[PDB]
Design an enzyme around this catalytic site. Sequence first.
Site, mmCIF file in Angstrom:
data_model
loop_
_atom_site.group_PDB
_atom_site.id
_atom_site.type_symbol
_atom_site.label_atom_id
_atom_site.label_comp_id
_atom_site.label_asym_id
_atom_site.label_seq_id
_atom_site.Cartn_x
_atom_site.Cartn_y
_atom_site.Cartn_z
ATOM 1 N N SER A 61 24.409 -47.984 66.968
ATOM 2 C CA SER A 61 22.962 -48.094 67.231
ATOM 3 C C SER A 61 22.174 -46.835 66.904
ATOM 4 C CB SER A 61 22.680 -48.469 68.703
ATOM 5 O OG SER A 61 23.174 -49.741 68.950
ATOM 6 N N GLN A 117 22.813 -59.164 71.897
ATOM 7 C CA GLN A 117 23.387 -59.450 70.586
ATOM 8 C C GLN A 117 22.809 -60.733 70.018
ATOM 9 O OE1 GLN A 117 24.943 -57.174 69.255
ATOM 10 N NE2 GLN A 117 26.024 -56.052 70.866
ATOM 11 N N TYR A 147 16.950 -53.662 76.293
ATOM 12 C CA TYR A 147 17.592 -53.217 75.048
ATOM 13 C C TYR A 147 18.297 -54.370 74.343
ATOM 14 C CZ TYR A 147 20.648 -50.233 72.146
ATOM 15 O OH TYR A 147 21.178 -49.532 71.078
ATOM 16 N N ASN A 149 19.806 -55.724 70.297
ATOM 17 C CA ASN A 149 19.924 -55.716 68.835
ATOM 18 C C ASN A 149 19.123 -56.848 68.220
ATOM 19 O OD1 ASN A 149 21.629 -53.511 68.615
ATOM 20 N ND2 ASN A 149 23.443 -54.730 68.955
ATOM 21 N N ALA A 315 27.187 -47.077 69.267
ATOM 22 C CA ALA A 315 28.615 -47.396 69.277
ATOM 23 C C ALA A 315 28.890 -48.587 68.373
ATOM 24 C CB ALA A 315 29.106 -47.731 70.692
ATOM 25 N N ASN A 340 34.962 -45.280 70.682
ATOM 26 C CA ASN A 340 33.767 -45.581 71.490
ATOM 27 C C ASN A 340 34.100 -45.166 72.928
ATOM 28 O OD1 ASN A 340 31.620 -46.684 72.931
ATOM 29 N ND2 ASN A 340 32.217 -48.788 72.550
#
EC number: 3.5.2.6
Length: 358
Positions: A61, A117, A147, A149, A315, A340
């Site tokens: 990210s 996601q 948050y 993606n 990560a 990670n």
Amino acid sequence: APQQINDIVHRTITPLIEQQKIPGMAVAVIYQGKPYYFTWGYADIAKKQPVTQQTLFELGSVSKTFTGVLGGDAIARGEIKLSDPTTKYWPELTAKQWNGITLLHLATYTAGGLPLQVPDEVKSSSDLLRFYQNWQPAWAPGTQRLYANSSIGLFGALAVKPSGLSFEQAMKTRVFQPLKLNHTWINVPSAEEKNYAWGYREGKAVHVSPGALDAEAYGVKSTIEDMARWVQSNLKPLDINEKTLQQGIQLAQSRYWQTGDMYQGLGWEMLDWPVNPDIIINGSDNKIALAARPVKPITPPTPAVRASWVHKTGATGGFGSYVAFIPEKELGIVMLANKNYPNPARVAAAWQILNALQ
């Protein structure tokens, strides 16, 4: 100073690596605007290939900071405005819940609960439309930061549409090449695979899998040298000669929302400097970082504040990265690792190092 820098870094990172069992690590410290590089361990354990200054790591990210700056550059070209409705750039997104959801909301995770996601089953363009068409928001636009993606990933894909370029082409020509990031890649070329570290996750050597909007949200790979130059460019945007890219870097550090002590930029996140390290260390644990939090708008967005801690974690399955810098002090750090390991350990180490050098 260069030996004082050396000793603060080794005092902090060498125990970190042993505690977290990190196989390979590269660190760049930007001190008075100049980079100092440190490497440990292995890019490929089985082959005993050590990490070097040209080893590629997955940024995860941290890629969002490139996406944020590319979007800022599009703003500065007049191609998009953050207040523009999403539907302006995706007319097929006809479902009613998208009324009032803007590019700002996508870029800053405030659309109302888009999920962390994009589902793995989303493969085709028609899959992706069906996914967003059927998404039910949990909050009204501009009220809660979650948050995601699937939020900033979509922002990146739409921000490049007036240009007529693909996201990858836009990023290469408008960001990577002007900044001379010659070993930074969304897709690593065949010729360059030799430098691409393996990631490691519970005994497995891994690279990130393809997914929808991966380039926009988590798909960049870079070297420790290119990431030092990225920090340099973000520390001192006035040294960049391409005017819309200079302005885009500035816009990515504008403060659009506040939650708690943190300010949301485009990709970058910011706090006032000096920072309480407990706030950023605890706030990087997924218990906070992945939680929904109420936001207040900032109006107009605050122009990039020099006395800021500006940072981003990143990560993938096999990699863990972190970038932090303080424009006022010309000071920053990049930490790239092929495991990670937990974010609070990265933040605490990075803060220990910059605190020592301020």
